Write an enzyme that holds these catalytic residues in place. Structure first.
Site, PDB file in Angstrom:
ATOM      1  N   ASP A 105       3.110   0.717   5.987  1.00  0.00           N
ATOM      2  CA  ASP A 105       4.368   0.407   5.324  1.00  0.00           C
ATOM      3  C   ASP A 105       4.040   0.276   3.843  1.00  0.00           C
ATOM      4  O   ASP A 105       3.129  -0.450   3.481  1.00  0.00           O
ATOM      5  CB  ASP A 105       4.903  -0.932   5.848  1.00  0.00           C
ATOM      6  CG  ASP A 105       6.057  -1.511   4.994  1.00  0.00           C
ATOM      7  OD1 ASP A 105       7.229  -1.081   5.167  1.00  0.00           O
ATOM      8  OD2 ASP A 105       5.801  -2.424   4.162  1.00  0.00           O
ATOM      9  N   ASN A 119      18.543  -7.580   1.856  1.00  0.00           N
ATOM     10  CA  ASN A 119      17.798  -6.497   2.489  1.00  0.00           C
ATOM     11  C   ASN A 119      18.352  -6.108   3.853  1.00  0.00           C
ATOM     12  O   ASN A 119      17.777  -5.310   4.564  1.00  0.00           O
ATOM     13  CB  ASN A 119      16.291  -6.824   2.515  1.00  0.00           C
ATOM     14  CG  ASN A 119      15.629  -6.566   1.141  1.00  0.00           C
ATOM     15  OD1 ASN A 119      15.974  -5.597   0.457  1.00  0.00           O
ATOM     16  ND2 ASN A 119      14.715  -7.422   0.742  1.00  0.00           N
ATOM     17  N   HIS A 161      15.360  17.216   5.910  1.00  0.00           N
ATOM     18  CA  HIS A 161      16.190  16.902   7.082  1.00  0.00           C
ATOM     19  C   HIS A 161      16.844  18.162   7.654  1.00  0.00           C
ATOM     20  O   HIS A 161      16.763  18.392   8.857  1.00  0.00           O
ATOM     21  CB  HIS A 161      17.244  15.846   6.722  1.00  0.00           C
ATOM     22  CG  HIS A 161      16.657  14.578   6.173  1.00  0.00           C
ATOM     23  ND1 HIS A 161      16.932  14.115   4.902  1.00  0.00           N
ATOM     24  CD2 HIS A 161      15.781  13.694   6.711  1.00  0.00           C
ATOM     25  CE1 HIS A 161      16.264  12.993   4.689  1.00  0.00           C
ATOM     26  NE2 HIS A 161      15.558  12.716   5.770  1.00  0.00           N
ATOM     27  N   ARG A 179      15.854  -2.339  13.826  1.00  0.00           N
ATOM     28  CA  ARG A 179      14.721  -2.135  12.921  1.00  0.00           C
ATOM     29  C   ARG A 179      14.578  -3.405  12.109  1.00  0.00           C
ATOM     30  O   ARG A 179      15.493  -3.737  11.303  1.00  0.00           O
ATOM     31  CB  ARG A 179      14.944  -0.932  11.973  1.00  0.00           C
ATOM     32  N   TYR A 180      13.452  -4.117  12.324  1.00  0.00           N
ATOM     33  CA  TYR A 180      13.153  -5.333  11.599  1.00  0.00           C
ATOM     34  C   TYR A 180      12.011  -5.155  10.608  1.00  0.00           C
ATOM     35  O   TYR A 180      11.185  -4.242  10.766  1.00  0.00           O
ATOM     36  CB  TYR A 180      12.780  -6.467  12.554  1.00  0.00           C
ATOM     37  CG  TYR A 180      13.773  -6.749  13.660  1.00  0.00           C
ATOM     38  CD1 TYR A 180      15.088  -6.253  13.628  1.00  0.00           C
ATOM     39  CD2 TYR A 180      13.387  -7.485  14.766  1.00  0.00           C
ATOM     40  CE1 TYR A 180      15.978  -6.515  14.658  1.00  0.00           C
ATOM     41  CE2 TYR A 180      14.267  -7.761  15.796  1.00  0.00           C
ATOM     42  CZ  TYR A 180      15.555  -7.270  15.744  1.00  0.00           C
ATOM     43  OH  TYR A 180      16.425  -7.559  16.776  1.00  0.00           O
ATOM     44  N   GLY A 228       4.233  13.273  -0.232  1.00  0.00           N
ATOM     45  CA  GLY A 228       3.216  12.400   0.336  1.00  0.00           C
ATOM     46  C   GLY A 228       2.972  12.536   1.820  1.00  0.00           C
ATOM     47  O   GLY A 228       1.848  12.753   2.262  1.00  0.00           O
ATOM     48  N   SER A 229       4.010  12.381   2.603  1.00  0.00           N
ATOM     49  CA  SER A 229       3.851  12.232   4.046  1.00  0.00           C
ATOM     50  C   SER A 229       3.760  13.567   4.802  1.00  0.00           C
ATOM     51  O   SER A 229       4.408  14.549   4.455  1.00  0.00           O
ATOM     52  CB  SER A 229       4.979  11.364   4.601  1.00  0.00           C
ATOM     53  OG  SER A 229       6.224  12.047   4.519  1.00  0.00           O
ATOM     54  N   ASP A 267       5.369   5.104  -7.113  1.00  0.00           N
ATOM     55  CA  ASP A 267       6.754   5.274  -6.603  1.00  0.00           C
ATOM     56  C   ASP A 267       7.533   3.950  -6.515  1.00  0.00           C
ATOM     57  O   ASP A 267       7.001   2.938  -6.077  1.00  0.00           O
ATOM     58  CB  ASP A 267       6.670   5.936  -5.210  1.00  0.00           C
ATOM     59  CG  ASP A 267       6.247   7.419  -5.284  1.00  0.00           C
ATOM     60  OD1 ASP A 267       6.375   8.038  -6.356  1.00  0.00           O
ATOM     61  OD2 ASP A 267       5.800   7.995  -4.269  1.00  0.00           O
ATOM     62  N   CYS A 327      11.350  15.630  -0.358  1.00  0.00           N
ATOM     63  CA  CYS A 327      10.733  14.360   0.019  1.00  0.00           C
ATOM     64  C   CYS A 327       9.595  14.650   0.962  1.00  0.00           C
ATOM     65  O   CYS A 327       9.199  15.833   1.127  1.00  0.00           O
ATOM     66  CB  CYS A 327      11.769  13.396   0.667  1.00  0.00           C
ATOM     67  SG  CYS A 327      11.208  11.645   0.966  1.00  0.00           S
TER      68      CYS A 327
END
Ligand SMILES: [Cl-]
Ligand SMILES: [Cl-]
Ligand SMILES: [Cl-]
Ligand SMILES: [Cl-]
Ligand SMILES: [Cl-]
Ligand SMILES: [Zn+2]
Length: 753
Positions: free
Chosen positions: A494, A120, A693, A520-521, A440-441, A604, A725
């Protein structure tokens, strides 16, 4: 140093409290000075070196630290820097950051982020031109040499870690000004630069170097694998350290012939993922080469079974001798959280089954000492009780009951085929042709979400805030005139943690951070047991969103394969078994949504291609089959009038797998001859009509002509109208105009009928 040595292939650098993210982001926003960033790096490295020394680790890595990504580090060191990054008089730390995060923060694009195998973690793609001049950049200093010298000043002898030339080039790509360049052809230019580095490492005092060649677990073109011999013939010599050629995450056997006559001092193999390769890989050893046996998982959080790991090592021993075996982590511990001891809210029974990076140090040492004959009897005994307590917590330790007790095809099939369902869905929703929806967002409530975590507001007040945001987002879609709505998911952090923290068979951590990309963790949930669903995970907010509009409202779920892939999985049962259990859990959530009047449901699976096994073959073809089957189990309990949606934007989509889901409606990111890939799609389909984008509001006419192009391939009966998206990255005004133009375009087509 026990007879059999212990070895660690790398250590997570993020800090036990995410110090590295904090100082790096502070440096980017002009808070931290260059000196403070470097001092924090130095302090992390020291702590980590000392932690490993104190635990007794014999072979301790250096050069594993990075402020961003180790592959990027090598690009900087070898001068693989595209010309556009050199034009702004940047200091070297800033060239690194400009390549990693992008040049716009220094102007008056970032390099491509790519998955590191099937971990990951993500690395920064090496990018090469015909003009690339490879050379040691003494500008900043030489990272490996300086960090090797830092450890030595502390009284810690380390083994520098570098990604090898073959892997480094193969994993890279030709820049846009050189599309003809085959990266592997650059080997003769880059090899002298590796040689100089290795010489400099020998000069500093390094005795051995870990040279990573993980692309050996992949299916490799002959033009690539035929090069291992001449690469290492060139690197090995009396003026450089001993080289340990290191592979992980997979099976090198198919590539054995490529590495059977290398002059290296030894090898490392992953015997956690592929213990069965031992015999064959051991047979290539000649000349007193050493075998590093990777038996402590660098990518999972489970206490290792010391009896079983010791027995695998003992087979290596039987095959090459004790003086030539090393006990090692299977891969870098970059992929595990730093330290279990900072977790205070875990069930005590479950915490006893875990081991994070810091604890893994003790484990390799225990195993090395065991096979060496030392008394670690207390640790073996404690370990054997933990392993037993864990095996006794699942339904069965027995693989016979486990194999049999895990999907009849009926469970994975809707009650009627799509044409029949379509008749019932038309009658129920009366959608027109060219129905419009979104994925969705929406643009974002930040404060209050954090306030409720901080205890500053009550659940009721947070609930009221969630509900006002849902209301605003629903009313906005109504004004635009969309046909199928979403609720905006304001309640969710998330798309995996939201589920992982509610499901049974899961634990979650407070501090279990793992680096994903740059600063980014992620804090992945952990599957500890048989999975099921104990409550309504998403029904409340969906039912509220549906109660304020007469239009159909999409429920929104994440599918089973994506939950599995973004979690730490059980290491005692197959992924397939876990995906299917997750599928059955989600089936209860779907059935609940449907029962509560949420009859349009989007499920999804963005992590599919990410979980694809690394080699073509049986494991891969099974994966695709069970991946699809898991989705179908989640979605096949519903009435014919219930409409299952699924959205796909995840890189190189496989239309054959998408077709296997039998979803009523799919949306596919789309805005050269690509429309032809989905020309044979069986149910309904929305090829995205604009790029979320791209920095421009498309006109109505632009929508009209894009819909015309699609109608050369698809029937209007099948066509749904939607963006590529989600829209959370756009401003509200650009979203209103774009979507308004989208709906007006749709309406024009309805009228022409
Ligand atoms: Cl600098
Ligand atoms: Cl295959
Ligand atoms: Cl088909
Ligand atoms: Cl037409
Ligand atoms: Cl149709
Ligand atoms: Zn998407």
């Amino acid at each position: 140093q026990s007879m059999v040595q212990s070895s660690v292939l790398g250590f997570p650098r993020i800090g036990g409290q995410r110090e590295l993210k904090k100082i790096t982001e502070a440096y980017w926003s002009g808070k931290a000075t260059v000196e403070e960033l470097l001092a924090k790096g130095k302090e992390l490295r020291e702590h980590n070196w000392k932690l490993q020394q104190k635990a007794g680790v014999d072979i301790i890595p250096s050069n594993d630290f990075s402020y961003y990504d180790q592959v990027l580090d090598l690009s900087l060191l070898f001068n693989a820097i595209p010309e556009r990054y050199t034009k702004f008089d940047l200091a070297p730390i800033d060239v690194l950051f400009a390549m990693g995060r992008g040049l716009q923060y220094y102007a008056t694009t970032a390099l491509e982020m790519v998955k590191w195998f099937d971990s990951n973690y993500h690395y920064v793609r090496p990018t090469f031109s015909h003009s690339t001049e490879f050379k040691l950049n003494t500008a900043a200093g030489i990272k490996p040499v300086d960090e090797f010298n830092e450890a030595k000043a502390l009284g810690v002898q380390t083994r520098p870690v570098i990604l090898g030339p073959v892997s480094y080039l193969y994993l890279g790509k030709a820049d846009k000004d050189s599309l003809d360049l085959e990266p592997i052809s650059l080997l003769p230019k880059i090899l002298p630069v590796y040689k100089e580095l290795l010489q400099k490492l020998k000069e500093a005092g390094a005795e051995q170097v870990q040279i990573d060649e993980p692309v050996l677990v992949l299916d490799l073109p002959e033009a690539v694998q035929s090069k291992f011999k001449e690469a290492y013939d060139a690197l090995v010599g009396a003026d450089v350290p001993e080289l340990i050629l290191t592979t992980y995450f997979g099976d090198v056997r198919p590539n054995l012939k490529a590495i059977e006559n290398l002059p290296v001092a030894g090898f490392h193999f992953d015997f956690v993922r592929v213990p069965e390769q031992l015999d064959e890989v051991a047979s290539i050893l000649k000349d007193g080469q050493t075998l590093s046996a990777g038996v402590v998982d660098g990518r999972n959080i489970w206490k290792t079974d010391f009896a079983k790991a010791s027995a695998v090592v003992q087979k290596a021993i039987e095959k090459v001798g004790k003086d030539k075996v090393v006990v090692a982590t299977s891969s870098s511990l970059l992929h595990t959280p730093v330290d279990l001891e900072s977790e205070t809210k875990l069930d005590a029974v479950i915490k006893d089954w875990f081991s994070f990076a810091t604890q893994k140090l003790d484990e390799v040492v225990v195993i090395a000492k065991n096979v060496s004959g030392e008394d670690v009897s207390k640790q073996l005994e404690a370990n054997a009780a933990s392993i037993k307590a864990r095996s006794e917590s699942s339904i069965t330790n027995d693989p016979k009951v486990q194999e049999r007790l895990t999907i009849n095809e009926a469970l994975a099939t809707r009650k009627a085929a799509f044409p029949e369902r379509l008749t019932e869905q038309k009658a129920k929703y009366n959608l027109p042709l060219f129905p419009t929806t979104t994925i969705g967002s929406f643009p974002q409530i930040r404060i209050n979400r954090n306030k409720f975590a901080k205890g500053q507001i009550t659940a009721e007040e947070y609930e009221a805030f969630i509900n006002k945001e849902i209301e605003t987002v629903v009313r906005f879609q109504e004004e635009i005139g969309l046909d199928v709505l979403v609720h905006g998911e304001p309640e969710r952090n998330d798309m995996v943690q939201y589920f992982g923290e509610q499901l049974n068979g899961f634990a979650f951590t407070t501090n279990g951070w793992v680096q994903s990309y740059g600063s980014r963790y992620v804090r992945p949930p952990i599957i500890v047991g048989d999975v099921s669903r104990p409550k309504a995970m998403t029904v409340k907010e969906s039912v509220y969103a549906q109660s304020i509009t007469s239009k159909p409202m999409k429920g929104m779920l994440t599918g089973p394969v994506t939950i599995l892939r973004w979690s730490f999985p059980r290491d005692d049962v197959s992924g397939k078994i876990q995906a299917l259990q997750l599928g059955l859990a989600l089936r209860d959530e779907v059935n609940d949504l449907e029962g509560a009047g949420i009859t349009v449901i989007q499920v999804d699976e963005p992590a599919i291609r990410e979980g694809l096994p690394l080699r073509a073959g049986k494991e891969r073809s099974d994966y695709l089959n069970w991946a699809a089957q898991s989705f179908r189990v989640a979605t096949s309990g519903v009435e014919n009038s219930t409409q299952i949606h699924s959205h796909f934007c995840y890189s190189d989509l496989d239309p054959n797998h998408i077709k296997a889901l039998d979803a009523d409606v799919v949306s596919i990111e789309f805005s050269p001859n690509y429309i032809q890939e989905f020309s044979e799609y069986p149910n309904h389909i929305g090829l995205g009509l604009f790029d979320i984008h791209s920095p421009r509001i498309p006109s109505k006419q632009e929508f009209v002509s894009r819909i015309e192009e699609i109608l050369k391939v698809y029937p209007a009966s099948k066509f749904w109208v939607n963006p590529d998206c989600g829209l959370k990255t756009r401003g509200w005004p650009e979203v209103k105009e774009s979507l308004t133009n989208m709906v007006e375009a749709a309406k024009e087509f309805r009228a022409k009928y």
